[PDB]
Amino acid sequence: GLTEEQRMMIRELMDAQMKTFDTTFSHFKNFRLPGVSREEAAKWSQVRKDLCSLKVSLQLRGEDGSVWNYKPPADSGGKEIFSLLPHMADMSTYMFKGIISFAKVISYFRDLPIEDQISLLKGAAFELCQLRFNTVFNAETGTWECGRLSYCLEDTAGGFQQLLLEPMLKFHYMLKKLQLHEEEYVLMQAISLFSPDRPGVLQHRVVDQLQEQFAITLKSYIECNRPQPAHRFLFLKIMAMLTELRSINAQHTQRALRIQDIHPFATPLMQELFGITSLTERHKILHRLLQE
Amino acid sequence: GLTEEQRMMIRELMDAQMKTFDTTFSHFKNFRLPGVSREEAAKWSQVRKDLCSLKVSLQLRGEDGSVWNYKPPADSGGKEIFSLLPHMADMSTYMFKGIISFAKVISYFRDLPIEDQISLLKGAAFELCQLRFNTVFNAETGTWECGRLSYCLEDTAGGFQQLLLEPMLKFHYMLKKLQLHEEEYVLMQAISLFSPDRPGVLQHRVVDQLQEQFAITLKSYIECNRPQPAHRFLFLKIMAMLTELRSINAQHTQRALRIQDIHPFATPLMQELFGISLTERHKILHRLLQEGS
């Protein structure tokens, strides 16, 4: 029931995903690990709220069968809250490079002006990273299973219902429950990537038309490949998750900027994406990664 | 009930213990960590039994409140059995240095010839280290609580009964059950240290006379401070434990040499202790004994 252009569109996205998603995280190496006034204090209090929402332990399984586990320190009003930030900055940077490589493989993305490519990746990188993370998220154990690395949500005092208050966690549980196919995830990534309303986009009409083509392909994929009645509104559920993910993106970017102000953690590539200091001149790494 | 000299003897030992036992292990730093032929097989078979008997997980608690935990690999037949050996060699070396400093500050020891000081430390270092380790051993949890570092015995089939088969573990459980005071531990250290029949000792009479006075002081200390029935025969029980500890020392030295043969792990100071002129054969220990405390 899909057109050939739709089947080819999905094949290119799946090809790009296969080439650029290290699902085992086997090439994520050389990462850092936690070591073995008035307004300023206001800033610190807000940052403590930002970091407290997402608290995870880190597990490292060795080739020999050994297991290293890191339990995060409780908040005592000090830099210890930033213990896992160097590690997460390396993980985010690794994931961002994989997202950049994903976009570059796609013909519809490569044929765009390079400044639109920069603007689209700047606005969507976090979203595509979370979409990839959802495919390794274990909702039964609350753990992102990243090959030999695992990030396990810490039992907060409150239980699931307390975790669901955090939009990012509620997003992963709700998306995982839809039990999407690989093809549906990669179409979600394309719809997010080709968002015409991203800051700094100039060819809005071209991107909007490309986004509609992917959305129609996703809508048609669901109609043709899922039991018609029960999945009647699955496409709309997916689109609603994408709108919520864009909101979570804006919130996390503001959290990152607040943490960066008081306690620098972002890598040079992360600084370009977050706007930390011509689109190309303000994004030289991203420009190099796109032109190679 | 103690003589004035006995009261002075215990005070000097306790003072020496306080100055040289880093009970919080706060100065134990820069240590290694696990990374993130028929006859030759019989050698490996024996070593696998030696390492499996003493199997522990490691906790590294940070000042910030963070906890790193290392679970050892299961034995699948390979050099995985040696994952924690570099770390344990660094911990043993640090404990040995504390023992050397303990002996150096004691007047009865520093006035001995340096060759005998080398021989006494060579024969007693492991024993005094185990006695200090017993004071941080948690028998309820099977964990040596070394300040920010914890070494928890791994569970095995058979439970406590299987662990007690290992003489080293049985020693720690039996000694902990005696509920000794600090003064009794430090007198045990002195009795072990001033053992006249250690290899290489020359002033046997001087060392034996020193050992007898520490034992007499220990017996008198117990007589004055432990009326309870539970502590009947405590002095004789302690002396029997010290004889057992000397046997375990000989057993551990042979284990270390077997493990060293297959998979080298010993630090230079450990090699000097395990090796068989005294000054030329123990250059680090010689230097440490000449330095100030």
Side-chain angles (χ1 to χ4, degrees), chain A residues 209-227:
Chain A
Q209 286 179 232
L210 291 168
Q211 193 189 41
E212 185 190 1
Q213 298 165 39
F214 290 117
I216 294 173
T217 299
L218 174 58
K219 186 174 181 290
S220 305
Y221 177 93
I222 293 171
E223 287 176 350
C224 301
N225 299 118
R226 296 190 161 256

Side-chain angles (χ1 to χ4, degrees), chain A residues 62 64-66, chain B residues 44 48 51-52 55 72-75 77-78 80-83:
Chain A
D64 53 359
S66 65
Chain B
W44 274 80
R48 289 185 195 96
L51 296 172
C52 183
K55 192 135 179 290
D75 191 355
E80 73 265 346
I81 51 185
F82 310 119
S83 61

Side-chain angles (χ1 to χ4, degrees), chain A residues 47 54 103 117 137 143 165 177 212 217 263:
Chain A
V47 161
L54 307 173
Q117 294 183 30
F137 182 60
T143 302
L165 311 179
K177 191 57 133 294
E212 185 190 1
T217 299
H263 179 96

Side-chain angles (χ1 to χ4, degrees), chain A residues 34 64 67-71 73, chain B residues 34 64 66-71 73:
Chain A
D64 53 359
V67 178
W68 274 106
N69 182 273
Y70 175 80
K71 184 171 77 176
Chain B
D64 55 358
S66 66
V67 180
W68 274 107
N69 185 87
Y70 174 80
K71 186 169 76 176

